[PDB]
Amino acid sequence: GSHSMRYFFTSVSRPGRGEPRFIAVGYVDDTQFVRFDSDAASQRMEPRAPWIEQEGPEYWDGETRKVKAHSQTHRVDLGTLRGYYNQSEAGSHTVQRMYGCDVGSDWRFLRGYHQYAYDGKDYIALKEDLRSWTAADMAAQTTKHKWEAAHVAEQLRAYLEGTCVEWLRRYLENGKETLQRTDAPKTHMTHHAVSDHEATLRCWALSFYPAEITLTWQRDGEDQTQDTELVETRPAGDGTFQKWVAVVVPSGQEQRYTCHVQHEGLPKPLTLRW
């Protein structure tokens, strides 16, 4: 189906001494494959998926060179933003940046992204057309003017539409054994009595990939959202994901209730019964 490559960058200033803590991570879909951490000893971009270890030393030197430049840009930015927002040197502040590209099932460019946040708030974001900017406030508007004058968007556009997609296609090939594989959820249902008249049915989805999934309950073939609880999809820690959804039912009426599971690893939606 569709695929994406995304990079996430976080810089946190450290008042009192030294440079910001900088952490960069890269993903293909829901799989992390590289990292950089300023606090680590190597000071290299490091592999985090087996299939990227295929890449040779020129890859790692280049990613290292580029990610250190990203780190220095963020360092300067934290100083600039402190100025724009009239903040003191006493507090810790955070810049976050995310960019990347989505492709559809044909692996052709679908969407690009490049956005920035300061202290957890929208600062500036490239618009869907990759030609203009959304500046959240007047500080960001100053950055927008600067980036318009220097034609930043046109250069981002070239990466997001071109280079980014090429990288993604290369990674999808080298990592084909896992990146192009779908893991359908392993499902089952559990039952818990809370009282002599009330029971909880819990529908589990385990070991699935990618993370995107839908669990829904029906009573007598109709959608039921009342008296249901659904947890946020969570990482198992082995690369796959977990989720469950529960409904409270009158004891003895369990058979009315069905759990419905949608996942791209499932040719057809799955139905579970107690």
């Binding site: 580029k66 430049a69 840009t73 300067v76 600039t80 500036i124 980036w147 220097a150 990466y159």
Partner: peptide, 9 residues
């Protein structure tokens, strides 16, 4: 692969 060039805000 990440961006070759970055820009300060």
């Amino acid at each position: 692969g990440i961006l070759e060039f970055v820009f300060t805000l």
